[PDB]
Enzyme design. Structure first.
Site, PDB file in Angstrom:
ATOM      1  N   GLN A  14      -7.577   7.106  12.726  1.00  0.00           N
ATOM      2  CA  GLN A  14      -7.788   6.344  11.503  1.00  0.00           C
ATOM      3  C   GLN A  14      -8.673   7.097  10.515  1.00  0.00           C
ATOM      4  O   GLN A  14      -8.826   6.690   9.362  1.00  0.00           O
ATOM      5  CB  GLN A  14      -8.405   4.976  11.825  1.00  0.00           C
ATOM      6  CG  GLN A  14      -9.850   5.029  12.258  1.00  0.00           C
ATOM      7  CD  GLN A  14     -10.346   3.699  12.786  1.00  0.00           C
ATOM      8  OE1 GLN A  14      -9.901   3.235  13.836  1.00  0.00           O
ATOM      9  NE2 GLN A  14     -11.276   3.076  12.056  1.00  0.00           N
ATOM     10  N   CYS A  36      -8.763   0.236  11.514  1.00  0.00           N
ATOM     11  CA  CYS A  36      -8.453   0.073  12.930  1.00  0.00           C
ATOM     12  C   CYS A  36      -7.487  -1.089  13.170  1.00  0.00           C
ATOM     13  O   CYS A  36      -6.669  -1.043  14.078  1.00  0.00           O
ATOM     14  CB  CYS A  36      -9.693  -0.143  13.783  1.00  0.00           C
ATOM     15  SG  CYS A  36     -10.806  -1.475  13.178  1.00  0.00           S
ATOM     16  N   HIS A  81     -13.904  -3.967  16.555  1.00  0.00           N
ATOM     17  CA  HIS A  81     -12.907  -2.906  16.636  1.00  0.00           C
ATOM     18  C   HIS A  81     -11.566  -3.317  17.241  1.00  0.00           C
ATOM     19  O   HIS A  81     -11.497  -3.721  18.396  1.00  0.00           O
ATOM     20  CB  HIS A  81     -13.509  -1.771  17.456  1.00  0.00           C
ATOM     21  CG  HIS A  81     -12.675  -0.536  17.490  1.00  0.00           C
ATOM     22  ND1 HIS A  81     -12.108   0.006  16.362  1.00  0.00           N
ATOM     23  CD2 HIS A  81     -12.340   0.283  18.513  1.00  0.00           C
ATOM     24  CE1 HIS A  81     -11.459   1.107  16.684  1.00  0.00           C
ATOM     25  NE2 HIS A  81     -11.585   1.298  17.983  1.00  0.00           N
ATOM     26  N   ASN A  95      -7.180   3.903  21.899  1.00  0.00           N
ATOM     27  CA  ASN A  95      -8.056   3.886  20.722  1.00  0.00           C
ATOM     28  C   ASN A  95      -7.394   4.634  19.558  1.00  0.00           C
ATOM     29  O   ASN A  95      -6.382   5.306  19.749  1.00  0.00           O
ATOM     30  CB  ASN A  95      -9.396   4.547  21.065  1.00  0.00           C
ATOM     31  CG  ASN A  95     -10.535   4.107  20.152  1.00  0.00           C
ATOM     32  OD1 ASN A  95     -10.340   3.365  19.194  1.00  0.00           O
ATOM     33  ND2 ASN A  95     -11.738   4.572  20.455  1.00  0.00           N
TER      34      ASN A  95
HETATM   35  C1  LIG Z   1     -17.701   0.484  15.569  1.00  0.00           C
HETATM   36  S1  LIG Z   1     -16.128   0.430  14.825  1.00  0.00           S
HETATM   37  C2  LIG Z   1     -15.887  -0.812  13.666  1.00  0.00           C
HETATM   38  C3  LIG Z   1     -15.120  -0.720  12.447  1.00  0.00           C
HETATM   39  N1  LIG Z   1     -14.740   0.556  12.050  1.00  0.00           N
HETATM   40  C4  LIG Z   1     -15.293   1.138  10.973  1.00  0.00           C
HETATM   41  O1  LIG Z   1     -16.163   0.523  10.336  1.00  0.00           O
HETATM   42  C5  LIG Z   1     -15.062   2.306  10.466  1.00  0.00           C
HETATM   43  C6  LIG Z   1     -14.946   3.576  11.251  1.00  0.00           C
HETATM   44  C7  LIG Z   1     -13.712   4.436  10.952  1.00  0.00           C
HETATM   45  C8  LIG Z   1     -13.546   5.683  11.718  1.00  0.00           C
HETATM   46  C9  LIG Z   1     -14.575   6.127  12.793  1.00  0.00           C
HETATM   47  C10 LIG Z   1     -14.384   7.396  13.565  1.00  0.00           C
HETATM   48  C11 LIG Z   1     -15.377   7.892  14.630  1.00  0.00           C
HETATM   49  C12 LIG Z   1     -15.062   9.200  15.336  1.00  0.00           C
HETATM   50  C13 LIG Z   1     -13.800  10.028  15.030  1.00  0.00           C
HETATM   51  C14 LIG Z   1     -12.824   9.501  13.962  1.00  0.00           C
HETATM   52  C15 LIG Z   1     -13.082   8.231  13.238  1.00  0.00           C
HETATM   53  C16 LIG Z   1     -15.791   5.220  13.030  1.00  0.00           C
HETATM   54  C17 LIG Z   1     -15.978   3.964  12.278  1.00  0.00           C
HETATM   55  C18 LIG Z   1     -14.808  -1.915  11.661  1.00  0.00           C
HETATM   56  O2  LIG Z   1     -15.778  -2.780  11.709  1.00  0.00           O
HETATM   57  N2  LIG Z   1     -13.695  -2.186  10.893  1.00  0.00           N
HETATM   58  C19 LIG Z   1     -13.525  -3.327  10.145  1.00  0.00           C
HETATM   59  C20 LIG Z   1     -14.253  -3.504   8.742  1.00  0.00           C
HETATM   60  C21 LIG Z   1     -15.908  -3.538   8.719  1.00  0.00           C
HETATM   61  C22 LIG Z   1     -16.560  -4.904   9.124  1.00  0.00           C
HETATM   62  N3  LIG Z   1     -18.009  -5.186   9.206  1.00  0.00           N
HETATM   63  C23 LIG Z   1     -19.064  -4.290   9.643  1.00  0.00           C
HETATM   64  N4  LIG Z   1     -18.912  -2.969  10.069  1.00  0.00           N
HETATM   65  N5  LIG Z   1     -20.375  -4.680   9.685  1.00  0.00           N
HETATM   66  C24 LIG Z   1     -12.658  -4.374  10.713  1.00  0.00           C
HETATM   67  O3  LIG Z   1     -11.850  -4.917   9.804  1.00  0.00           O
HETATM   68  N6  LIG Z   1     -12.809  -4.669  12.093  1.00  0.00           N
HETATM   69  C25 LIG Z   1     -11.967  -5.700  12.549  1.00  0.00           C
HETATM   70  C26 LIG Z   1     -11.744  -5.956  13.979  1.00  0.00           C
HETATM   71  C27 LIG Z   1     -11.188  -7.105  14.469  1.00  0.00           C
HETATM   72  C28 LIG Z   1      -9.680  -7.245  14.389  1.00  0.00           C
HETATM   73  C29 LIG Z   1      -9.062  -8.433  14.877  1.00  0.00           C
HETATM   74  C30 LIG Z   1      -9.907  -9.550  15.472  1.00  0.00           C
HETATM   75  C31 LIG Z   1     -11.378  -9.439  15.563  1.00  0.00           C
HETATM   76  C32 LIG Z   1     -11.984  -8.348  15.117  1.00  0.00           C
HETATM   77  C33 LIG Z   1     -12.808  -6.969  12.052  1.00  0.00           C
HETATM   78  O4  LIG Z   1     -14.073  -7.033  12.287  1.00  0.00           O
HETATM   79  N7  LIG Z   1     -12.006  -8.019  11.341  1.00  0.00           N
HETATM   80  C34 LIG Z   1     -12.681  -9.209  10.856  1.00  0.00           C
HETATM   81  C35 LIG Z   1     -13.318  -9.095   9.679  1.00  0.00           C
HETATM   82  C36 LIG Z   1     -12.504  -8.823   8.418  1.00  0.00           C
HETATM   83  C37 LIG Z   1     -11.212  -9.620   8.142  1.00  0.00           C
HETATM   84  C38 LIG Z   1     -10.413  -9.370   6.910  1.00  0.00           C
HETATM   85  C39 LIG Z   1     -10.867  -8.337   5.923  1.00  0.00           C
HETATM   86  C40 LIG Z   1     -12.131  -7.552   6.188  1.00  0.00           C
HETATM   87  C41 LIG Z   1     -12.947  -7.793   7.431  1.00  0.00           C
END
Ligand SMILES: CSCC(NC(=O)Cc1ccc(-c2ccccc2)cc1)C(=O)NC(CCCNC(=N)N)C(=O)N[C@@H](Cc1ccccc1)C(=O)NCCc1ccccc1
Length: 215
Positions: free
Chosen positions: A19, A25, A163, A182
């Site tokens: 990603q 993700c 995640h 992943n």
């Molecule tokens: C620890 S990694 C978490 C994460 N990822 C990231 O933030 C980003 C990230 C991208 C690439 C690497 C990377 C590392 C090494 C090598 C290559 C790449 C690391 C981090 C994430 O939180 N993604 C999001 C958006 C940020 C939210 N808040 C925050 N960080 N404080 C995300 O949308 N996660 C989903 C997961 C999920 C999916 C389905 C059910 C439950 C949970 C989520 O929380 N979804 C709910 C929230 C939301 C809903 C609609 C629009 C926006 C946010």
């Protein structure tokens, strides 16, 4: 209810993707689950476009590189009638303008099934459906630097998963684990996969937001 399961052995899983530095993700988790269903249906495994999801699924509720849900992705795929292949709509790890093109859609679903929030429930979906999109708590340095083995975080929250990922099977070592694909590249963990503690009180809540598309 089999002992072990690993959908990679049956041609349901595409290689590991990356990603990049984008909070997409949810999109990779989605394409992953979709790729597996289409395969079970058509018999053909074709990589799907995450950039397609990141750029056009705003209406369903996703925020591109800023977040989203796998279900908002299945929904988008449902309301849009199709989704472009990965080749046709390459990944750019950044939010661009929507460029969906029906001429290139290679997949589609007609909804999705939210699995009951119990690990036993997840185990049956996995054993009888294929790869399942799930959300785990991966906000710990230990997970980021997981190298190999059965991951266990006694600090993991079962209620705040951040995640999205793909469960491709489960088994045990000669101790039970969920096989998880992943989206951080193959250099991460075990070739991009991680073995996570199974039947350990929904560790990191892996079975709390499981779901899969219906094609
Ligand atoms: C620890 S990694 C978490 C994460 N990822 C990231 O933030 C980003 C990230 C991208 C690439 C690497 C990377 C590392 C090494 C090598 C290559 C790449 C690391 C981090 C994430 O939180 N993604 C999001 C958006 C940020 C939210 N808040 C925050 N960080 N404080 C995300 O949308 N996660 C989903 C997961 C999920 C999916 C389905 C059910 C439950 C949970 C989520 O929380 N979804 C709910 C929230 C939301 C809903 C609609 C629009 C926006 C946010």
């Amino acid at each position: 209810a089999p002992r072990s399961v690993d959908w990679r052995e049956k041609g349901y899983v595409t290689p590991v993707k990356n990603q990049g530095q984008c909070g997409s993700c949810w999109a990779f988790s989605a394409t992953g689950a979709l790729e597996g269903q289409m395969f079970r249906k058509t018999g053909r495994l074709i990589s799907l476009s995450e950039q397609n999801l990141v750029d056009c699924s705003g209406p369903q509720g996703n925020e591109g590189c800023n977040g989203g849900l796998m279900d908002y992705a299945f929904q988008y795929v449902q309301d849009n009638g199709g989704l472009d292949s990965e080749e046709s709509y390459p990944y750019e790890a950044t939010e661009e303008s929507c460029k969906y093109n029906p001429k290139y859609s290679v997949a589609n679903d007609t909804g999705f099934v939210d699995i009951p929030k119990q690990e036993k429930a997840l185990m049956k979906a996995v054993a009888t459906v294929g790869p399942i999109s799930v959300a785990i708590d991966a906000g710990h340095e230990s997970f980021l630097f997981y190298k190999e083995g059965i991951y266990f975080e006694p600090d993991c929250s079962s209620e705040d998963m951040d995640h999205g990922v793909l469960v491709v099977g489960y088994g045990f070592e000669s101790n039970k684990y969920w096989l998880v694909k992943n989206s951080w590249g193959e250099e991460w963990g075990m070739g991009g996969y991680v073995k996570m503690a199974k039947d350990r009180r929904n560790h990191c809540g892996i079975a709390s937001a499981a779901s899969y598309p219906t094609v």
